[PDB]
Amino acid sequence: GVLYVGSKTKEGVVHGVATVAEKTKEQVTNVGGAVVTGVTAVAQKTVEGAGSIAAATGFVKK
Amino acid sequence: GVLYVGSKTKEGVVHGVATVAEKTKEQVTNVGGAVVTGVTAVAQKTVEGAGSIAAATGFVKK
Amino acid sequence: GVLYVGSKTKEGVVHGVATVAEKTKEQVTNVGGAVVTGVTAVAQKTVEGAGSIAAATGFVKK
Amino acid sequence: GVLYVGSKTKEGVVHGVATVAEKTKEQVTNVGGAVVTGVTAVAQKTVEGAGSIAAATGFVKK
Amino acid sequence: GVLYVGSKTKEGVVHGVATVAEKTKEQVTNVGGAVVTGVTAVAQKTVEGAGSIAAATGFVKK
Amino acid sequence: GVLYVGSKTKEGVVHGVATVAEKTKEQVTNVGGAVVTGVTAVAQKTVEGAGSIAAATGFVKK
């Protein structure tokens, strides 16, 4: 398999993840896993086999 | 298999994920998994085999 | 397998992850895992085999 | 004459003058005169007598 | 004449004059005259008599 | 004449004049005259008599 990526750009601005939170009490931000950000972002074969990517969060309150 | 991607652009602006929350109490933001953001974003063969990507969250309150 | 990435750009600005939180009490930020940020961001074969990437957080309050 | 001004406020945000210009060639911004901006802005007896406030601009092109 | 100004505020943000210009060639910014900016901005008797405030600009091109 | 100004504030932020210019060739910024900026900004009797405040700029191109 052959994968060819050609990018010819001018004045590129990229904003991957932006989270804004205010006037709360409990704030939990969980950013992770496989995040690719940029002008030429390529993600090939992220997981192979029995692998796993969780990027999980849990909230428990009593 | 052959995959050809050709991008010729000028003045490109990309905003992948933007979350805004205010005037709450409990705020849980879970951003993850396989997120590709950018001017030339290519995602080929993200999962192969018995793999898995969760990117899961859970809220429990009593 | 052959993977070719060619980037020819001018005046590129990339913002990967930006989190803003204010006027709260409890704030937990967990950024990790496999985060690739930049003008030419390539992520190939992040996980191979029985590996795993958690990037997980948990909130417990009684 | 008696002038009474009483302001009791919380979390006040004031934006007086905001000018945005882009993708032009000739841009002339003239901001002046008697501009009062703020949470408690009072303007009493700006001009008295034969006075004058111009705050004027002129564009000539041949 | 009696002028009473009473300001009782909390967390005040004031932006008087904001000018943004881009992707032009000729840019002339003229900010002046009588500009009062702030949380408690009072302007009383700016001009008295035969006085004058110009705050003027002129563009000539041949 | 009696002028009373009373300011009782907490966490005050003031931005008087902000000019941003980019991607131009000719840029002329003229800020002056009578500019009062601050948390408690008072401007009384700026001009008296036959006085004048210009704060003027001129652009000539052939």
PDB file of all heavy atoms in Angstrom, chain A residues 10-42:
ATOM      1  N   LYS A  10      -0.818  28.350   1.969  1.00  0.00           N
ATOM      2  CA  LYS A  10      -0.267  29.628   2.396  1.00  0.00           C
ATOM      3  C   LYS A  10      -1.184  30.237   3.444  1.00  0.00           C
ATOM      4  O   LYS A  10      -2.406  30.256   3.264  1.00  0.00           O
ATOM      5  CB  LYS A  10      -0.106  30.583   1.207  1.00  0.00           C
ATOM      6  CG  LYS A  10       0.769  31.791   1.490  1.00  0.00           C
ATOM      7  CD  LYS A  10       1.200  32.469   0.201  1.00  0.00           C
ATOM      8  CE  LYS A  10       0.182  33.506  -0.241  1.00  0.00           C
ATOM      9  NZ  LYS A  10       0.203  34.707   0.639  1.00  0.00           N
ATOM     10  N   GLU A  11      -0.591  30.739   4.530  1.00  0.00           N
ATOM     11  CA  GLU A  11      -1.323  31.370   5.633  1.00  0.00           C
ATOM     12  C   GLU A  11      -2.407  30.440   6.185  1.00  0.00           C
ATOM     13  O   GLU A  11      -3.606  30.704   6.083  1.00  0.00           O
ATOM     14  CB  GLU A  11      -1.918  32.720   5.210  1.00  0.00           C
ATOM     15  CG  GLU A  11      -1.177  33.436   4.090  1.00  0.00           C
ATOM     16  CD  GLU A  11      -1.838  34.743   3.698  1.00  0.00           C
ATOM     17  OE1 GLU A  11      -1.985  35.622   4.572  1.00  0.00           O
ATOM     18  OE2 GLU A  11      -2.215  34.888   2.517  1.00  0.00           O
ATOM     19  N   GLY A  12      -1.958  29.335   6.776  1.00  0.00           N
ATOM     20  CA  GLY A  12      -2.853  28.366   7.384  1.00  0.00           C
ATOM     21  C   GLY A  12      -2.860  28.498   8.896  1.00  0.00           C
ATOM     22  O   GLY A  12      -1.805  28.576   9.529  1.00  0.00           O
ATOM     23  N   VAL A  13      -4.064  28.523   9.463  1.00  0.00           N
ATOM     24  CA  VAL A  13      -4.263  28.593  10.906  1.00  0.00           C
ATOM     25  C   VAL A  13      -5.139  27.420  11.323  1.00  0.00           C
ATOM     26  O   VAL A  13      -6.227  27.227  10.770  1.00  0.00           O
ATOM     27  CB  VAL A  13      -4.905  29.927  11.334  1.00  0.00           C
ATOM     28  CG1 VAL A  13      -5.110  29.958  12.840  1.00  0.00           C
ATOM     29  CG2 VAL A  13      -4.044  31.098  10.886  1.00  0.00           C
ATOM     30  N   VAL A  14      -4.666  26.640  12.294  1.00  0.00           N
ATOM     31  CA  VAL A  14      -5.362  25.445  12.755  1.00  0.00           C
ATOM     32  C   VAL A  14      -5.545  25.534  14.263  1.00  0.00           C
ATOM     33  O   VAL A  14      -4.590  25.822  14.993  1.00  0.00           O
ATOM     34  CB  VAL A  14      -4.600  24.157  12.383  1.00  0.00           C
ATOM     35  CG1 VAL A  14      -5.436  22.933  12.719  1.00  0.00           C
ATOM     36  CG2 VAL A  14      -4.227  24.162  10.908  1.00  0.00           C
ATOM     37  N   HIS A  15      -6.770  25.286  14.725  1.00  0.00           N
ATOM     38  CA  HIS A  15      -7.091  25.200  16.147  1.00  0.00           C
ATOM     39  C   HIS A  15      -7.701  23.829  16.405  1.00  0.00           C
ATOM     40  O   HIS A  15      -8.847  23.572  16.020  1.00  0.00           O
ATOM     41  CB  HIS A  15      -8.047  26.315  16.568  1.00  0.00           C
ATOM     42  CG  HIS A  15      -7.498  27.693  16.366  1.00  0.00           C
ATOM     43  ND1 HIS A  15      -6.789  28.362  17.341  1.00  0.00           N
ATOM     44  CD2 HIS A  15      -7.553  28.529  15.302  1.00  0.00           C
ATOM     45  CE1 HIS A  15      -6.433  29.550  16.887  1.00  0.00           C
ATOM     46  NE2 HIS A  15      -6.884  29.677  15.652  1.00  0.00           N
ATOM     47  N   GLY A  16      -6.940  22.951  17.054  1.00  0.00           N
ATOM     48  CA  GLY A  16      -7.383  21.587  17.268  1.00  0.00           C
ATOM     49  C   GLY A  16      -8.509  21.430  18.268  1.00  0.00           C
ATOM     50  O   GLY A  16      -9.632  21.078  17.896  1.00  0.00           O
ATOM     51  N   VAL A  17      -8.224  21.688  19.543  1.00  0.00           N
ATOM     52  CA  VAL A  17      -9.193  21.521  20.619  1.00  0.00           C
ATOM     53  C   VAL A  17      -9.184  22.777  21.478  1.00  0.00           C
ATOM     54  O   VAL A  17      -8.128  23.190  21.970  1.00  0.00           O
ATOM     55  CB  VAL A  17      -8.888  20.279  21.480  1.00  0.00           C
ATOM     56  CG1 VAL A  17      -9.791  20.246  22.703  1.00  0.00           C
ATOM     57  CG2 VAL A  17      -9.047  19.008  20.659  1.00  0.00           C
ATOM     58  N   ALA A  18     -10.358  23.378  21.659  1.00  0.00           N
ATOM     59  CA  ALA A  18     -10.519  24.557  22.502  1.00  0.00           C
ATOM     60  C   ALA A  18     -11.735  24.355  23.391  1.00  0.00           C
ATOM     61  O   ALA A  18     -12.858  24.233  22.891  1.00  0.00           O
ATOM     62  CB  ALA A  18     -10.670  25.826  21.659  1.00  0.00           C
ATOM     63  N   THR A  19     -11.515  24.321  24.703  1.00  0.00           N
ATOM     64  CA  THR A  19     -12.580  24.144  25.680  1.00  0.00           C
ATOM     65  C   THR A  19     -12.610  25.347  26.611  1.00  0.00           C
ATOM     66  O   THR A  19     -11.581  25.717  27.187  1.00  0.00           O
ATOM     67  CB  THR A  19     -12.388  22.857  26.489  1.00  0.00           C
ATOM     68  OG1 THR A  19     -11.298  23.022  27.404  1.00  0.00           O
ATOM     69  CG2 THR A  19     -12.099  21.681  25.566  1.00  0.00           C
ATOM     70  N   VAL A  20     -13.786  25.953  26.756  1.00  0.00           N
ATOM     71  CA  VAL A  20     -13.981  27.111  27.620  1.00  0.00           C
ATOM     72  C   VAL A  20     -15.095  26.791  28.605  1.00  0.00           C
ATOM     73  O   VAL A  20     -16.190  26.387  28.200  1.00  0.00           O
ATOM     74  CB  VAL A  20     -14.319  28.380  26.814  1.00  0.00           C
ATOM     75  CG1 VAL A  20     -14.459  29.576  27.743  1.00  0.00           C
ATOM     76  CG2 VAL A  20     -13.257  28.640  25.756  1.00  0.00           C
ATOM     77  N   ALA A  21     -14.814  26.969  29.894  1.00  0.00           N
ATOM     78  CA  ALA A  21     -15.790  26.716  30.947  1.00  0.00           C
ATOM     79  C   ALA A  21     -15.658  27.790  32.014  1.00  0.00           C
ATOM     80  O   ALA A  21     -14.543  28.126  32.423  1.00  0.00           O
ATOM     81  CB  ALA A  21     -15.596  25.326  31.564  1.00  0.00           C
ATOM     82  N   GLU A  22     -16.791  28.329  32.459  1.00  0.00           N
ATOM     83  CA  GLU A  22     -16.779  29.370  33.475  1.00  0.00           C
ATOM     84  C   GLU A  22     -18.078  29.328  34.265  1.00  0.00           C
ATOM     85  O   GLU A  22     -19.088  28.782  33.813  1.00  0.00           O
ATOM     86  CB  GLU A  22     -16.571  30.757  32.855  1.00  0.00           C
ATOM     87  CG  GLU A  22     -17.726  31.233  31.994  1.00  0.00           C
ATOM     88  CD  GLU A  22     -17.383  32.477  31.200  1.00  0.00           C
ATOM     89  OE1 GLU A  22     -16.668  32.355  30.183  1.00  0.00           O
ATOM     90  OE2 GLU A  22     -17.828  33.576  31.592  1.00  0.00           O
ATOM     91  N   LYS A  23     -18.033  29.923  35.459  1.00  0.00           N
ATOM     92  CA  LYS A  23     -19.191  30.033  36.349  1.00  0.00           C
ATOM     93  C   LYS A  23     -19.778  28.660  36.681  1.00  0.00           C
ATOM     94  O   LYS A  23     -20.994  28.464  36.699  1.00  0.00           O
ATOM     95  CB  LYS A  23     -20.254  30.959  35.752  1.00  0.00           C
ATOM     96  CG  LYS A  23     -19.702  32.288  35.259  1.00  0.00           C
ATOM     97  CD  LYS A  23     -19.936  33.395  36.273  1.00  0.00           C
ATOM     98  CE  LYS A  23     -19.679  34.765  35.667  1.00  0.00           C
ATOM     99  NZ  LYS A  23     -20.629  35.073  34.563  1.00  0.00           N
ATOM    100  N   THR A  24     -18.894  27.705  36.945  1.00  0.00           N
ATOM    101  CA  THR A  24     -19.256  26.369  37.402  1.00  0.00           C
ATOM    102  C   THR A  24     -18.640  26.130  38.777  1.00  0.00           C
ATOM    103  O   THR A  24     -18.083  27.037  39.399  1.00  0.00           O
ATOM    104  CB  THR A  24     -18.794  25.297  36.409  1.00  0.00           C
ATOM    105  OG1 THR A  24     -17.416  24.983  36.648  1.00  0.00           O
ATOM    106  CG2 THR A  24     -18.956  25.782  34.978  1.00  0.00           C
ATOM    107  N   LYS A  25     -18.766  24.898  39.269  1.00  0.00           N
ATOM    108  CA  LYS A  25     -18.024  24.500  40.462  1.00  0.00           C
ATOM    109  C   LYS A  25     -17.069  23.346  40.168  1.00  0.00           C
ATOM    110  O   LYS A  25     -15.864  23.450  40.419  1.00  0.00           O
ATOM    111  CB  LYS A  25     -18.983  24.133  41.602  1.00  0.00           C
ATOM    112  CG  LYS A  25     -20.277  23.485  41.187  1.00  0.00           C
ATOM    113  CD  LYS A  25     -21.361  23.769  42.215  1.00  0.00           C
ATOM    114  CE  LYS A  25     -21.522  25.263  42.443  1.00  0.00           C
ATOM    115  NZ  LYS A  25     -22.534  25.560  43.492  1.00  0.00           N
ATOM    116  N   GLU A  26     -17.589  22.247  39.628  1.00  0.00           N
ATOM    117  CA  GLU A  26     -16.789  21.075  39.306  1.00  0.00           C
ATOM    118  C   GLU A  26     -16.565  21.024  37.803  1.00  0.00           C
ATOM    119  O   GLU A  26     -17.525  20.933  37.031  1.00  0.00           O
ATOM    120  CB  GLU A  26     -17.469  19.790  39.787  1.00  0.00           C
ATOM    121  CG  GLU A  26     -17.008  19.318  41.156  1.00  0.00           C
ATOM    122  CD  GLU A  26     -17.867  19.867  42.279  1.00  0.00           C
ATOM    123  OE1 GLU A  26     -19.089  19.609  42.272  1.00  0.00           O
ATOM    124  OE2 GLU A  26     -17.322  20.552  43.169  1.00  0.00           O
ATOM    125  N   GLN A  27     -15.301  21.087  37.393  1.00  0.00           N
ATOM    126  CA  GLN A  27     -14.924  21.032  35.988  1.00  0.00           C
ATOM    127  C   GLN A  27     -13.797  20.025  35.815  1.00  0.00           C
ATOM    128  O   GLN A  27     -12.726  20.179  36.410  1.00  0.00           O
ATOM    129  CB  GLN A  27     -14.491  22.409  35.478  1.00  0.00           C
ATOM    130  CG  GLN A  27     -14.696  22.608  33.985  1.00  0.00           C
ATOM    131  CD  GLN A  27     -13.499  22.168  33.167  1.00  0.00           C
ATOM    132  OE1 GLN A  27     -12.356  22.279  33.609  1.00  0.00           O
ATOM    133  NE2 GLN A  27     -13.757  21.662  31.966  1.00  0.00           N
ATOM    134  N   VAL A  28     -14.041  19.001  35.003  1.00  0.00           N
ATOM    135  CA  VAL A  28     -13.056  17.965  34.714  1.00  0.00           C
ATOM    136  C   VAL A  28     -12.860  17.917  33.207  1.00  0.00           C
ATOM    137  O   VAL A  28     -13.801  17.615  32.462  1.00  0.00           O
ATOM    138  CB  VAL A  28     -13.489  16.593  35.255  1.00  0.00           C
ATOM    139  CG1 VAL A  28     -12.398  15.561  35.010  1.00  0.00           C
ATOM    140  CG2 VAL A  28     -13.821  16.684  36.737  1.00  0.00           C
ATOM    141  N   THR A  29     -11.644  18.215  32.760  1.00  0.00           N
ATOM    142  CA  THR A  29     -11.290  18.185  31.347  1.00  0.00           C
ATOM    143  C   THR A  29     -10.303  17.050  31.117  1.00  0.00           C
ATOM    144  O   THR A  29      -9.240  17.011  31.746  1.00  0.00           O
ATOM    145  CB  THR A  29     -10.692  19.519  30.899  1.00  0.00           C
ATOM    146  OG1 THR A  29     -11.720  20.516  30.858  1.00  0.00           O
ATOM    147  CG2 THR A  29     -10.068  19.386  29.518  1.00  0.00           C
ATOM    148  N   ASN A  30     -10.654  16.133  30.218  1.00  0.00           N
ATOM    149  CA  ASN A  30      -9.814  14.984  29.888  1.00  0.00           C
ATOM    150  C   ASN A  30      -9.620  14.962  28.375  1.00  0.00           C
ATOM    151  O   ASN A  30     -10.505  14.519  27.636  1.00  0.00           O
ATOM    152  CB  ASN A  30     -10.435  13.684  30.389  1.00  0.00           C
ATOM    153  CG  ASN A  30      -9.542  12.483  30.152  1.00  0.00           C
ATOM    154  OD1 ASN A  30      -8.400  12.444  30.611  1.00  0.00           O
ATOM    155  ND2 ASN A  30     -10.059  11.495  29.433  1.00  0.00           N
ATOM    156  N   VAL A  31      -8.466  15.438  27.919  1.00  0.00           N
ATOM    157  CA  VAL A  31      -8.121  15.465  26.502  1.00  0.00           C
ATOM    158  C   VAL A  31      -6.920  14.555  26.299  1.00  0.00           C
ATOM    159  O   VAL A  31      -5.872  14.752  26.927  1.00  0.00           O
ATOM    160  CB  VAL A  31      -7.821  16.889  26.010  1.00  0.00           C
ATOM    161  CG1 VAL A  31      -7.388  16.865  24.552  1.00  0.00           C
ATOM    162  CG2 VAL A  31      -9.039  17.781  26.195  1.00  0.00           C
ATOM    163  N   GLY A  32      -7.067  13.564  25.425  1.00  0.00           N
ATOM    164  CA  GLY A  32      -5.993  12.621  25.189  1.00  0.00           C
ATOM    165  C   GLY A  32      -6.283  11.630  24.083  1.00  0.00           C
ATOM    166  O   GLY A  32      -7.020  11.935  23.141  1.00  0.00           O
ATOM    167  N   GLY A  33      -5.704  10.437  24.188  1.00  0.00           N
ATOM    168  CA  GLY A  33      -5.875   9.426  23.166  1.00  0.00           C
ATOM    169  C   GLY A  33      -4.926   9.614  22.002  1.00  0.00           C
ATOM    170  O   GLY A  33      -3.707   9.656  22.187  1.00  0.00           O
ATOM    171  N   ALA A  34      -5.475   9.728  20.793  1.00  0.00           N
ATOM    172  CA  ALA A  34      -4.693   9.953  19.577  1.00  0.00           C
ATOM    173  C   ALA A  34      -5.231  11.215  18.910  1.00  0.00           C
ATOM    174  O   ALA A  34      -6.125  11.149  18.062  1.00  0.00           O
ATOM    175  CB  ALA A  34      -4.759   8.746  18.647  1.00  0.00           C
ATOM    176  N   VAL A  35      -4.685  12.364  19.297  1.00  0.00           N
ATOM    177  CA  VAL A  35      -5.093  13.658  18.762  1.00  0.00           C
ATOM    178  C   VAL A  35      -3.966  14.180  17.883  1.00  0.00           C
ATOM    179  O   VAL A  35      -2.849  14.412  18.364  1.00  0.00           O
ATOM    180  CB  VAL A  35      -5.428  14.656  19.881  1.00  0.00           C
ATOM    181  CG1 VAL A  35      -5.745  16.022  19.295  1.00  0.00           C
ATOM    182  CG2 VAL A  35      -6.592  14.144  20.715  1.00  0.00           C
ATOM    183  N   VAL A  36      -4.257  14.365  16.599  1.00  0.00           N
ATOM    184  CA  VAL A  36      -3.296  14.887  15.634  1.00  0.00           C
ATOM    185  C   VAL A  36      -3.815  16.230  15.142  1.00  0.00           C
ATOM    186  O   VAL A  36      -4.921  16.311  14.592  1.00  0.00           O
ATOM    187  CB  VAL A  36      -3.077  13.920  14.460  1.00  0.00           C
ATOM    188  CG1 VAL A  36      -1.874  14.350  13.637  1.00  0.00           C
ATOM    189  CG2 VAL A  36      -2.899  12.498  14.971  1.00  0.00           C
ATOM    190  N   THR A  37      -3.021  17.279  15.339  1.00  0.00           N
ATOM    191  CA  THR A  37      -3.395  18.633  14.956  1.00  0.00           C
ATOM    192  C   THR A  37      -2.242  19.292  14.215  1.00  0.00           C
ATOM    193  O   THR A  37      -1.089  19.213  14.648  1.00  0.00           O
ATOM    194  CB  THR A  37      -3.772  19.475  16.184  1.00  0.00           C
ATOM    195  OG1 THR A  37      -4.837  18.835  16.898  1.00  0.00           O
ATOM    196  CG2 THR A  37      -4.209  20.869  15.764  1.00  0.00           C
ATOM    197  N   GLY A  38      -2.556  19.938  13.103  1.00  0.00           N
ATOM    198  CA  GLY A  38      -1.553  20.675  12.362  1.00  0.00           C
ATOM    199  C   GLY A  38      -1.956  20.866  10.921  1.00  0.00           C
ATOM    200  O   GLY A  38      -2.953  20.325  10.450  1.00  0.00           O
ATOM    201  N   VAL A  39      -1.133  21.644  10.214  1.00  0.00           N
ATOM    202  CA  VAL A  39      -1.441  22.001   8.831  1.00  0.00           C
ATOM    203  C   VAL A  39      -1.549  20.753   7.965  1.00  0.00           C
ATOM    204  O   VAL A  39      -2.485  20.610   7.168  1.00  0.00           O
ATOM    205  CB  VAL A  39      -0.384  22.980   8.286  1.00  0.00           C
ATOM    206  CG1 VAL A  39      -0.562  23.177   6.792  1.00  0.00           C
ATOM    207  CG2 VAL A  39      -0.466  24.310   9.020  1.00  0.00           C
ATOM    208  N   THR A  40      -0.606  19.827   8.112  1.00  0.00           N
ATOM    209  CA  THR A  40      -0.618  18.555   7.392  1.00  0.00           C
ATOM    210  C   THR A  40      -0.652  17.444   8.437  1.00  0.00           C
ATOM    211  O   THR A  40       0.390  16.942   8.862  1.00  0.00           O
ATOM    212  CB  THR A  40       0.594  18.423   6.470  1.00  0.00           C
ATOM    213  OG1 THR A  40       0.767  19.636   5.728  1.00  0.00           O
ATOM    214  CG2 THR A  40       0.400  17.266   5.501  1.00  0.00           C
ATOM    215  N   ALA A  41      -1.858  17.060   8.844  1.00  0.00           N
ATOM    216  CA  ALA A  41      -2.062  16.048   9.872  1.00  0.00           C
ATOM    217  C   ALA A  41      -2.441  14.734   9.205  1.00  0.00           C
ATOM    218  O   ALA A  41      -3.472  14.651   8.530  1.00  0.00           O
ATOM    219  CB  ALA A  41      -3.143  16.483  10.862  1.00  0.00           C
ATOM    220  N   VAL A  42      -1.610  13.712   9.397  1.00  0.00           N
ATOM    221  CA  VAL A  42      -1.840  12.387   8.837  1.00  0.00           C
ATOM    222  C   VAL A  42      -1.797  11.375   9.973  1.00  0.00           C
ATOM    223  O   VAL A  42      -0.853  11.373  10.772  1.00  0.00           O
ATOM    224  CB  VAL A  42      -0.802  12.030   7.755  1.00  0.00           C
ATOM    225  CG1 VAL A  42      -1.169  10.718   7.081  1.00  0.00           C
ATOM    226  CG2 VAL A  42      -0.692  13.149   6.728  1.00  0.00           C
TER     227      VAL A  42
END
